[PDB]
Amino acid sequence: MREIVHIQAGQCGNQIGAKFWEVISDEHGIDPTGTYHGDSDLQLDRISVYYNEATGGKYVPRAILVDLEPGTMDSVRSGPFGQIFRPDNFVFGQSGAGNNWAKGHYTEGAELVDSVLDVVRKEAESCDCLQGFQLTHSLGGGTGSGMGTLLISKIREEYPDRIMNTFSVVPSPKVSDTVVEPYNATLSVHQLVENTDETYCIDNEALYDICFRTLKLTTPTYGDLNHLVSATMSGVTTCLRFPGQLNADLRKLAVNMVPFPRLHFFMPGFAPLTSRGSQQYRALTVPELTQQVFDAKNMMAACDPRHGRYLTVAAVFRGRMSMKEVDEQMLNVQNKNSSYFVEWIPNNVKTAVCDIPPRGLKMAVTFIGNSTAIQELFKRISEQFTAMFRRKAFLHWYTGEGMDEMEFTEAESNMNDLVSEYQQYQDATAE
Amino acid sequence: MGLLTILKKMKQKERELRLLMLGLDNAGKTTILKKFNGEDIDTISPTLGFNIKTLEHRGFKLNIWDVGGQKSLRSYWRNYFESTDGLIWVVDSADRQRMQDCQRELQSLLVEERLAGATLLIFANKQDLPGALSSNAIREVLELDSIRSHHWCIQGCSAVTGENLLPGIDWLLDDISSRIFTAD
Amino acid sequence: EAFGESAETRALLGRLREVHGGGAEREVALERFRVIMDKYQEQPHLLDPHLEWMMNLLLDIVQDQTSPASLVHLAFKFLYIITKVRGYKTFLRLFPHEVADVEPVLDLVTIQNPKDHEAWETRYMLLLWLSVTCLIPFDFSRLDMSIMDRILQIAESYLIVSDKARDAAAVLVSRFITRPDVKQSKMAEFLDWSLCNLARSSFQTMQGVITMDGTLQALAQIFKHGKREDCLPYAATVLRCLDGCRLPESNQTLLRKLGVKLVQRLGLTFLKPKVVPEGVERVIEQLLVGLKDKDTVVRWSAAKGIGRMAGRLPRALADDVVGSVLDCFSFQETDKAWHGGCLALAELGRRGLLLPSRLVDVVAVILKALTYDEKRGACSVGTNVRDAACYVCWAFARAYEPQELKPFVTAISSALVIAAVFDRDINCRRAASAAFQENVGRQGTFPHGIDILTTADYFAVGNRSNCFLVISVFIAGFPEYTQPMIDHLVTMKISHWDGVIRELAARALHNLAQQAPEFSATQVFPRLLSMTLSPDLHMRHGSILACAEVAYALYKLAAQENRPVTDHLDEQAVQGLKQIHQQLYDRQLYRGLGGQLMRQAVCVLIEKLSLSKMPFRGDTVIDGWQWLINDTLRHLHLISSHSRQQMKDAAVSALAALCSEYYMKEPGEADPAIQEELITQYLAELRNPEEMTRCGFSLALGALPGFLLKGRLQQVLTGLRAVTHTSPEDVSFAESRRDGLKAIARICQTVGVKAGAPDEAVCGENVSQIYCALLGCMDDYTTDSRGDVGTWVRKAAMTSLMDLTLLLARSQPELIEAHTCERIMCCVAQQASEKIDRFRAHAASVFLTLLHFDSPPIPHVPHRGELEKLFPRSDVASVNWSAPSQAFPRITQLLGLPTYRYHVLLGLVVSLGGLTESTIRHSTQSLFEYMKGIQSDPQALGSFSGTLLQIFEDNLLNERVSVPLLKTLDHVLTHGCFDIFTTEEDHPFAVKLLALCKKEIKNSKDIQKLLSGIAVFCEMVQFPGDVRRQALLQLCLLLCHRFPLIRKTTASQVYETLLTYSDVVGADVLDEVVTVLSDTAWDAELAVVREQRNRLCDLLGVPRPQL
Ligand SMILES: Nc1nc2c(ncn2[C@@H]2O[C@H](COP(=O)(O)OP(=O)(O)OP(=O)(O)O)[C@@H](O)[C@H]2O)c(=O)[nH]1
Ligand SMILES: Nc1nc2c(ncn2[C@@H]2O[C@H](COP(=O)(O)OP(=O)(O)OP(=O)(O)O)[C@@H](O)[C@H]2O)c(=O)[nH]1
């Protein structure tokens, strides 16, 4: 029985975590009251991985929500599923970090970081054997950007033998017009490289473009992006909550998908693409899903998987497809002589097959690969980070709190070295 | 909680204050409140409740809660003595027939446990009138020397004319800011 | 400063009545309103001037009886957002408080549904509004189910709501039951209702705990905002009911916090508010234990209760409380107990309760709290007990007086400044600085209280690195904060767990020793000489660093009076510097994880000792240091990669300092016995199969001084060049070749220039051989399993070609030849146009540094005027070469020159056809901008095509430049660049291009190379004549390949070309070709595809192929 502690910080982080928990609860068959009412025995053989069995046969979540601002806290407390989260697992202040990374990591977010450690430690004491912590936040802001880094740096010192996985949400100028976002993203990535084993990047520009073109929505709001983020999160954590032949734990998955220490950013995806409201319209097959998992349109990041090498590939199928039918399809797409052969679907790919399908869909698929194209996500922020650094714009706010140009240049050098290593590995011999 | 947050929270309470204003009927307390904030006097009506007013002055934020003077409301003044730093009491000098109707209530407001600590300030209004008693006579008719557990300072002022309206609040603020600590 | 979004706010609300039906518009407005309001979360006092009208535009909507429920909910959402931003306490004073606003509000709240989770913002705010209407000085009976009963029922039904509305029910009942007419009517009823809920509910369910929390909050608010004499009779029953529940044992933090908050309030009701039932004896018993809780929120709440209770009780009990709280600092407690005790002491001192009798005790504990850091694992704990000590010290300014604090000021002021500088947490430093400022402003009896604040203000204790080399010296300048400040650093930080604390402390001591040399040489150095024998690993590193730093500082100080270094340090201390190496060599401490740290420390120690000119020359200590350096430069692969560069750059520096200090016989010469062996061993170590051995030995041999290279320079140069040469065995040896060039560059920079001396320095006799080795490593393009590692070998190959070219320019510029200079310039230009970003930036920087160098100007600069005009001085620091957008537009202009055309184009082809997307997108746009200017001139286009064909011919059968070039040709042809060559039949250029393409597509197997070939073959159909027909034939050969994907791609490309160019096929036969290329499965068996291929050939006039 391997348990996982889920933590949420920042407005966007909490909004994503609430939706993800609601999705994985509706898929497992858990009414919003707390009891169980599903119709499948497979929805309980691994429920202990994210739910504590309290008295009375109830399943208490393990989501530790923290937020300096008392906004999203009250909304999640009175949500469709707000009554599930323990009430002393909510840790908040009054004034946030004011879009400054040096506020939610040094002067403000380090004022509740001690209450966070007490809560995450009180939650882990009941577990029989902890596997690894988890965090869901956005690189944009101060309580998501600085608080997450502070907690990741503080927990690694007391639990070095635990896996550290995050779900960073890179912002984009299209979604937010804030100008102090490049610095918060750079400083967050600087800490998310030396104290993180895995990081699932969910760029906001990709979801914005998807909602603008694919879904054809009028004004894509935050709900449309949160729905896709929660869908991708539920599709990624399919092996850690359901049985199957590929019993890849968290540590095993991180070791098999992350050969290098610094390189650990993935490009998660999910298909088919849907929206809120209606969903039932067309039933997809295994060939169509495989053809669409590997399309740059189904990806949640502004990167072209085809343009770049393939470090490690993995896919998770959900529905009445059999690992034998999947192997037949995964052994004819890595062959040129084979018809309908693809050049971007690589070899030695990891593949899974689930029984319980997602909500509102009979068949789906999730992609969790790591391509060098992700470098584009790091360069877009580099340029915006240099043009504003030469003029020293909005730097007094950082220098007054305690930060200095030393950390800025260190983060810049780290990002440059990472981009250089990515570009160097992109040109490697296949055999 | 750290020391910085404690200091930031204490500064908010030190800068913000609350002043409970009371007085018998037609004592001229709302005619003095409007003048302190700069408003019209020819549009005041007998208030039958309580009025809250927030205004900045010398950096401080004066939260003045003024209550009427009708007897029917005198039995509901127990809902204003919380977090009260100053207690203003208006007295009509020309009402020398009800100076014992305001002395009987003044001897019951200082003994309160909640008001035990706030600075008292007596405002003798209606001084420009012909039969208006001076501050010395009011200090003796109300028996102000008997008070000892409160820092009182009877002062003669006016509303329609406006005389010594600023010093009255200045002295109260100076006396409230002199305390290093307070009860809770 | 002020609110500036109000101009947009009044318009938003104006649209509230229109976006009430739509969902997208409502969400956009709500999100917009929230992003407009969250900007002033730090400045809540800036929205007060606008709290008047902003409210009138909201409550006025719900007041209208002719509005739907959606609009009411949307308005309540904005109201709740405004309350969250500003605050309910300061915002409900604006809500209507008339007797005619009560029955309206009540019916409004009663029209709600607690099950509706979407409208939770309407139920949470409405209740609050009711509280306002409960402030009227009127009786509920005058308004007239009664109103009091309805309010009580609503409160009882909401006090068990799992949503936020429960909180709204706390402030409501707190004002309704505490009324004159309702504290004699509903108070007893709500009291029997709370006792039943507390006795029945349990903390094992989610609903039982919710009701318990609600009841506890309601009781705590009632006892807080309620009369003391009214809630006194019912003070024992509630206490007994709370004690019978066993809250401390429950596993709930909020429940325990509320229980403590209720217990402290109940205790405050027994005592009279002045400037003691047996029940009180229990209240205290429930508060002290609260300080020894696991959570900090419980201790923070218990501290306030204890502070409030000690002030309403006598002076005998007040002293007993302090005596009992002092017991928490015993030798059998954790850090949480100390934190709680410090919080309680601060809360007690803030009110002025501690007597001078407890000065000898309290002061005897705070000194231990400011420096609390008890290692509790990999990291240490105590940052909580330290932040509390700051607040405790801040309270002494208001409690004790100067006369009562003078005996302990000498120790308090020093401790404050010690904890306000070298602290690891910025919060602790800021708290200590604030406490010091408060003590100086009130007491004013601190030594130099004003001078210490001006230099260490709130905006000065921010940068930790600055506090260790700026504020430390300023504080040590006075004789009151020198010896204790040094002792603290010696006995705390230099023995810390983190390594940044053992490096910063050493650097701070380096400067502190300048103001107190006697104390650091006679009292501190002996303590650092004995600390090295400590079994602790973090203690030995710190002691070594301190011994090195203090030694360097003493040497620098003695250098002023041209006095020897032995004046400050005695010979006893000198013998320690010799035995430190023997002690480490005997115990064999150079193993395990700490071996690398010990080696790094000893390297810095030896470097600082050799840089001070110690009396160690001619002793076995020098031999031991040399052996240790050799062993460290001998075993490098065993060290982790996260700290290999540091050990590589420190060992070489230490060896150079030793070889440039001790290893000398006379001025201008050295001991031949050591010169005949060191160089020999190094040359026998530069041929070591292990790549890490050479990587460490090359730099060590190159870092030698100039007097130690006299006569043996040719041998060293030959040995270094032998490593730079590639061989079948050394294929993936890039790090070794990099160090080989780095050492050569270092030797060249050290020896300088001297004519008539090839064995002593560089001259015209060996400059050609040196330049040949530097120009040969630039062509290294190895592609190992890791990737393009050869780039590394090029990096050091660029700087080596820069610093060298300048060296001659500063002595004998005539040695630089014209051909070599032109080759170096062309190679740098090629290297400054590579798809890579980090390497291209360095290449452009080197190019600019070499071009702008005019002191003196460097000879043999091709097109020097054009290069200066295309790359002015202002475009050096402002242009970001790392960004392709801010690099390619300026690099593509070099194609105009003749010399910068072949190499520049070869370098840009890699970026115009690589794998990255943004780089290609930028390079194509930059190339099109230049081609647009040379599109009409036929000579320029012909020269460009000739250069491209020459580059193609040069890199033939090469998968590094062939694929990028073929990919770039596709875009060049699709854009329409070679439009002038299409008006002539049988163009030699298009013929040779097709011939080379046929060569490159000969037996092509990989699909990546086949795609570019197919694209080029389909983009070449534009050229009429024999190139049109022959090219078409190739397409046919690709329509029946060995894979169906190739056939499908070829068919798609042919269909696209048929639609692009219409003059290629006649209109009479175009219909048949279009119909045959549509209803034909090109991914089927070849038996059926051959018929379609023959049919298409018969129509396109292409001769029937033959197997
Ligand atoms: N996808 C998505 N992005 C969001 C959401 N909320 C905010 N963001 C983005 O995240 C950034 C803002 O960070 P927040 O999470 O709002 O901030 P915070 O972490 O609470 O920090 P403070 O502003 O300091 O209080 C911007 O780039 C927003 O576009 C959300 O619900 N979904
Ligand atoms: N002549 C004169 N009349 C004054 C003066 N100050 C106030 N008044 C009048 O005294 C009367 C009572 O003052 P108000 O403020 O209106 O009433 P109140 O004192 O607030 O009492 P409540 O109505 O019980 O709340 C009004 O007619 C005022 O205009 C003054 O200095 N001179």
Ligand SMILES: [Mg+2]
């Ligand atoms: Mg926020």
Ligand SMILES: [Mg+2]
């Ligand atoms: Mg009035």
